[PDB]
Design a binder for these strands. Structure first.
Lengths: 93, 107, 581, 86, 95, 93, 107, 87, 98
DNA sequence: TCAGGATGTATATATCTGACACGTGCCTGGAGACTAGGGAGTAATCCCCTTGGCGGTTAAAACGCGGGGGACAGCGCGTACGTGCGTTTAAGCGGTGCTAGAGCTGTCTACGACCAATTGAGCGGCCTCGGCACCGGGATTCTCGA
DNA sequence: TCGAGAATCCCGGTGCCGAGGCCGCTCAATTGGTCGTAGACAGCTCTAGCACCGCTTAAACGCACGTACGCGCTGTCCCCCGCGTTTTAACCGCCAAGGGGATTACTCCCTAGTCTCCAGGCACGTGTCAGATATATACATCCTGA
């Protein structure tokens, strides 16, 4: 009965990227488990990544090196630009 | 004491609180950070809008308003690094894009 | 007065060598004195200092203990070494066994002297391929040998022989390569088992850090092994200015010279042969240039102020402006030699005056390099000035080293500046022709005086020896000078030691010893660009050289010579290092 | 409620079907011995995935196998299926 | 008629162009039920799990015919045999 | 300065299996990291295995299904025999 | 109140307490069990004695008292399922056992 | 002149013909063509470039300038290359 | 007439001598300046222990041996003993690298 | 090169089917408030890790030439699945029940956290000495030709 | 069809440096007595899987038939195996600073812990429209023959 999904989140992303484009339920589910699994890799690898240095608390640098080490290629630079941009925007207020 | 979601302070979609508490109870680390779920929300914004944007371009190329997992596979494998990250993992209902070998076709 | 208690401590450990096979009286308690050289000695005569040095080694032979010959290179150490071999072979009729250890570069000298001096001693030499080494390897195991040659690198590979056999008297050479404590060659001697007696022989005294504690002050002598290992901290602080280093420490250092009386022997050539009339040691001080101006100090701001600041950002770019060649395409994008690329350095600028004048005055210059990247770049621009020269390096593979000298020593040869490194040649190079020496950068250890000067001061050069030491204003290699030269001149007491460690006329260790103790007041005086015409006067040896330089002056002083230097062309400042970091 | 036993429980995959399935792979020529070996490797892989699935469902103390157990079986099998949950 | 192999080209284009399901549902249904009866009795299967395993092994098996096709074209012989496919499952690290 | 390894454990295993057989340091290290990594798979997979059912505490059944699902083949039957034998021997006292 | 290690109650070698506390602080689960580290100790006994036993048989085959990582690789790859589990992971200094292809050798 | 360090045998060829020859002799293959050398050094440089990228990522995260052995153990362990005997 | 061997027999004796021995094959220092040189491109002043050099060197060493072994099986399956760029690029292609 | 056929396609349409959005109950994420312990920027501190070099010694590394044999096209031919053509036929398909257990909630504990006290167990420094590496040299074993 | 050269293990001793012990230390394992709490049964829904079950129909199979294709054979050369020879830079050893990983220790500090209080997303009806099957047609593309 009780289930959780991103749903309207990803839908609003679609509204702010391609307003005239629609999405089906199978697409919302495959992208749901997609972002859930990508998060499973980021946080899953960040766990042992923070465990190497015996650091108890996880911080933004642990996730930084985590996802930066996760996906190779130039995409990581955009991840740093947008990610650190949102970090500075959040801490700025 | 007006309640304002901190996810809206960064101007994002994916919530900081849900991924924050989910990361807490997810027994990944004994403690948690402050800006870490915000950075997670950010990379989810850029990746979700990334692959969703290529999917929108594929659906626009096929003259379809909605999107299809076929167009999802085409969008993934078309991009270089996006297919490089997803090359090991398979897909569901996506399929294989048409390809023809060099000498397989006759003269 | 901790050295006074060492007189009683030796009696217990002194009989380790004799029985098991006042420091004067304990050494002087047995009477054997023979001044006359052996009758079987053939091939020459022994000088008064060689006769006394013989009997001085016989004074060591009194109680048979170990000894040290610290004297200067060029006094015939081989003659004094082969003398004791043939002396003990006759008088005491022990006839052996004998073992010598000499470097391979000088082994050609030691192997050639077995003909003249001692024809009757059958020898053995290990060199070349292992098959040629195996030839005499099987012959010696049958018991055939008298004096056996060998080098340092084979000591670990000769473990087969030396482990099963046993010797009596071993002799070595190049005792200052032994200076590494943990070195395998030092550990192999303990693995070597032992023998009766030995003579540790070095060409130069202690160098680099605090005076030698490992071998001469521990490993060589029976009492001295474990004794000072506790005292090592007390005597190290000797080396709060006048009170320590002058007032009380005087006698403290004198007690260090008091214990070493029978042990070390060092005598300069000027006190025996004195064929060299005198030397001349000058200096020069230049200033910075375009790349070496505050941009230099600015280059320190980028990196710190890779790694190894002393090497990378300091020693490299202080002599030649651009190093590692990645920045070469910045200043000179064509990477092609043209006019005045080599004159943009401050240290290199001074040489534009001397090279034209030394050709007209007919002087031959010796050059010693560090940072071997400088060796090629020097020679490269040396093609632009178009003057003759000869090269050399450590990659010569020992072949051309002996061959190139006959081309250099030729009188009709116009080759002037002679390329060398400091560590190359092993001081056996035997060059008497060139009367001038120039050095770009300071060497840390005294060997700069104990190697480069031994090329000049050695027999065969009767002219004045000249030295030019380059330095720049407000630079890092400044403080190394005081550190290298001045701070390591504590060995000045050691070069003074051998003077009163010799026969030692009484007035030497008080009256004339204070003369060296008057040299520290000039250190504060020196602690407190110049002119091209100022160096012009000090480089001429006599009056007719002063007359020809004025004729050379009027030639180049009418025309402008651009300018003497070049300045930082303002764009390369901020453009250079911002794209590298 | 009832039981129906019919033959051909192994090779029931039909050569036109699996042949077209190979045609999706881009293969040009298909021999006659490819079908049997293909059902052999598919049979072994089937043993692996279903052994994993029954390990899950058996651990859950339930009599019903769910798609989640298949998503996890493939998960630790090296391929992550999406859209059905997990 | 048509020249041999051209119809195969048109087919391959028609299939690789379309994302629709290829193998038939119910034979796979009684396949999984039959092979599952050997292990444990009375297993309940949703259609979503049947689509899960069916599409999984379907696409992976397509990758097996594709890898086998590359081994065949490298073998200089277009025809696939048991040897190149057993070498495919051998290099894949299954057996 | 402070490091931990099984060491004398595995050595005593060698003494109770092959008394006349010796072991080197490289072998003790490769088997050290071997058993540490096998434990990393058992407990690592048992984590999410217990997370599927939302069970907070981990028990002997979680490790049972864990290692039983880890290594395929008949070896798992011996793992059940020896393992459950030690469980009954421990709980019997 | 005599202290008796509970690892000796099961007659094993690998300790229950060290793996128990290490599993606790290893942030794998929010809680821990009772017999779980005992079962871990058991499987470590049977696996360690397993591969160590095959290593002893290989060293005995090569007439060597001690064991070599070479003999470790031979023992691993010789067994079917043991090499099946370790087939993906590599080794250190172990190497590759001698093998000769069918038609590679001449007649 | 010859002072330029540009002229030299490049470092990617440090692995030589008899080196990789013996290596393939351990591999079991007999007859080797010409391009196996350059191509194998290409895959070598690419893969080792990825591995040193991972290593400098882990070590760079620790703020330490020293890449350790446990680092390589963690990178290879994450890739599936896990190397025992050290960690 | 001098002494020789039939072509390929020396290769057999070699392969037996190498596959029989566990000693290290590729040379340390070239791999040292290889890792230092390729590492200089990413980040400055990296410090490398010899244990890590043995780690990566033995890792890529043995894995590359497995690459020549897999390429050898693809070659013997190709009916041509000689290995070309094609079977090794098919080896790294089936391995899932590129 | 074009007549005569097998596969695609965009212009009405009309027609089932899922996606979207427009309001309602309801678990819930945040925003103040107050304790507590992980960590960081300090600072000594000793052992390896880096730069510039020398002096040698080899066992590999590179080059040149013979030559053995397989890659490598070219050709001949015996099949054999590819391509239709009927002929069954089991896959769907919607339309009927049936039910075993998934799931959800309620309740009473057996059971792991958790702190205070107690020590043998296992981890750092000596020590010593038998198994392993190495050099000969000789009894074959292996390979290749008369 | 077998009788001639190198290659390699088998002893036959010798150095040699870690492996096994052995001992001192010290601290995480072990024990005892609280103490809060998931979890282990127990009961209740109710639901989607599980079979018929008649009906329909594209799909599968047996059969004919027939050119591509791979299997075998056959000649040509050129490339790598294998000899020889130079040659040559890693491998040790050795110089001489300077600097970067780890241990105490301490005292400020930032995000768990918890407690109260509020607004946001998500399960649920809803009615309206984007898309898939059915259909006709000038146009797009491969085959067989000249």
């Amino acid at each position: 009965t009780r289930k959780e999904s991103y749903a309207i989140y990803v839908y609003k992303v679609l509204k702010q990227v391609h307003p005239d484009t629609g999405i089906s339920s199978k697409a919302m589910s495959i992208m749901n488990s997609f972002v859930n699994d990508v998060f499973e890799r980021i946080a899953g690898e960040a766990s042992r990544l923070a465990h190497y240095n015996k650091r108890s608390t996880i911080t933004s640098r642990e996730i930084q090196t985590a996802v930066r080490l996760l996906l190779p290629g130039e995409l990581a630079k955009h991840a740093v630009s947008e990610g650190t941009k949102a970090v500075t925007k959040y801490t700025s207020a | 004491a007006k309640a304002k979601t901190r996810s809206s302070r960064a101007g994002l979609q994916f919530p900081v609180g849900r991924v924050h508490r989910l990361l807490r109870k997810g027994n990944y680390a004994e403690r948690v950070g402050a800006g870490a779920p915000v950075y997670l929300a950010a990379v989810l914004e850029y990746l979700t809008a990334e692959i969703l944007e290529l999917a929108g371009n594929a659906a626009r190329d096929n003259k379809k308003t909605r999107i299809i997992p076929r167009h999802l596979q085409l969008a993934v494998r078309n991009d270089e690094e996006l297919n490089k990250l997803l090359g090991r993992v398979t897909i569901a209902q996506g399929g294989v894009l048409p390809n023809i070998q060099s000498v397989l076709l006759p003269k | 007065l901790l050295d006074q208690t060492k007189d009683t401590r030796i009696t217990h450990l002194l009989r380790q060598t004799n029985a098991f096979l006042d420091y004067y009286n304990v050494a002087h308690r047995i009477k054997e004195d023979i001044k006359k050289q052996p009758s079987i000695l053939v091939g020459g005569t022994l000088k008064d200092y060689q006769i006394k040095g013989l009997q001085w080694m016989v004074s060591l032979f009194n109680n048979h203990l170990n000894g040290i010959l610290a004297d200067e290179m060029g006094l015939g150490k081989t003659i004094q070494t082969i003398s004791l071999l043939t002396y003990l072979y006759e008088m005491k009729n022990i006839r052996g066994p004998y073992l010598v250890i000499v470097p391979l570069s000088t082994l050609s000298n030691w192997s050639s002297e077995f003909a003249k001096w001692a024809p009757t001693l059958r020898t053995i030499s290990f060199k070349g391929s292992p098959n040629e080494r195996k030839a005499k390897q099987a012959k010696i195991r049958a018991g055939e040998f008298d004096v056996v040659l060998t080098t340092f690198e084979y000591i670990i590979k000769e473990r087969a022989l030396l482990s099963k056999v046993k010797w009596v008297h071993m002799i070595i050479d190049e005792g200052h390569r032994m200076k590494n404590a943990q070195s395998k060659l030092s550990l192999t001697l303990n693995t070597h088992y032992h023998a009766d007696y030995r003579l540790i022989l070095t060409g130069t005294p202690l160098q680099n850090n605090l005076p030698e504690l490992w071998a001469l002050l521990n490993f060589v002598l029976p009492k001295i092994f474990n004794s000072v290992k506790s005292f090592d901290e007390w005597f190290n602080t000797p080396f709060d200015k006048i009170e320590l280093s002058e007032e009380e420490t005087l006698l403290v250092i004198r007690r260090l010279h008091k214990v070493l009386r029978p042990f070390l022997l060092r005598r300069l050539k000027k006190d025996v042969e004195k064929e060299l009339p005198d030397k001349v040691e000058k200096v020069v001080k230049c200033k910075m240039s375009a790349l070496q101006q505050i941009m230099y100090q600015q280059m320190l701001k980028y990196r710190r102020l890779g790694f190894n600041n002393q090497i990378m950002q300091l020693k490299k770019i202080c002599n030649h402006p651009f190093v590692f060649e990645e920045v070469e395409d910045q200043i000179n994008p064509t990477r092609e030699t043209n006019d005045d690329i080599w004159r943009v350095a401050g240290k290199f600028e001074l040489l534009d005056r001397i090279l034209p004048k030394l050709k007209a005055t007919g002087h031959r210059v010796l050059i010693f390099f560090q940072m071997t990247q400088i060796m090629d770049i020097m020679e490269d621009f040396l093609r632009y000035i178009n003057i003759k020269y000869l090269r050399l390096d450590g990659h010569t593979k020992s072949d051309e080293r002996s061959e190139l000298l006959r081309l250099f020593n030729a009188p009709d040869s116009e080759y002037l500046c002679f390329i060398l490194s400091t560590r190359a040649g092993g001081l056996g190079l035997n060059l008497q022709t060139a009367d001038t020496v120039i050095i770009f950068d300071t060497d840390w250890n005294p060997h700069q005086d104990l190697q480069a000067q031994d090329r000049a001061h050695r027999i065969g050069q009767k002219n004045e020896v000249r030295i030019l030491r380059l330095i720049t204003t407000n630079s890092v290699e400044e403080v190394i000078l005081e550190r290298a030269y001045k701070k390591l001149d504590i060995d000045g007491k050691v070069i003074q030691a051998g003077k009163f460690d010799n026969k030692s006329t009484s007035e030497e260790q008080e009256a004339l010893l204070r003369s060296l103790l008057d040299a520290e007041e000039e250190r504060r005086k020196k602690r407190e660009e110049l002119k091209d015409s100022e160096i012009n006067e000090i480089l001429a040896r006599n009056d007719e050289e002063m007359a020809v330089l004025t004729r050379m002056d009027e030639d180049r002083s009418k025309k402008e010579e651009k300018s003497r230097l070049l300045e930082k062309k303002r764009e390369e400042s901020e453009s250079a290092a911002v794209y590298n970091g | 409620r009832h039981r129906k036993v019919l033959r051909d429980n192994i090779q029931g995959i039909t050569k036109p079907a699996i042949r077209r399935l190979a045609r999706r792979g881009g293969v040009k020529r298909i021999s006659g011995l490819i079908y049997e070996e293909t059902r052999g490797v598919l049979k072994v892989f089937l043993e692996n995935v279903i052994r994993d699935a029954v390990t899950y469902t058996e651990h859950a103390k339930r009599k019903t196998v769910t798609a989640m157990d298949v998503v996890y079986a493939l998960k630790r099998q090296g391929r992550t299926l999406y859209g059905f949950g997990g | 008629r048509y020249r041999p192999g051209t119809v195969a080209l048109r087919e391959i284009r028609r299939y690789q162009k379309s994302t629709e399901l290829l193998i038939r549902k119910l034979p796979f249904q009684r396949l999984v039920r039959e092979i599952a009866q050997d292990f444990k009795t009375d297993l309940r299967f949703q259609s979503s799990a049947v689509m899960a395993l069916q599409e999984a092994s379907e696409a992976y098996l397509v990758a097996l015919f594709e890898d086998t096709n590359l081994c065949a074209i490298h073998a200089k012989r277009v025809t696939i045999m048991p040897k190149d496919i057993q070498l495919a499952r051998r290099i894949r690290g299954e057996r």
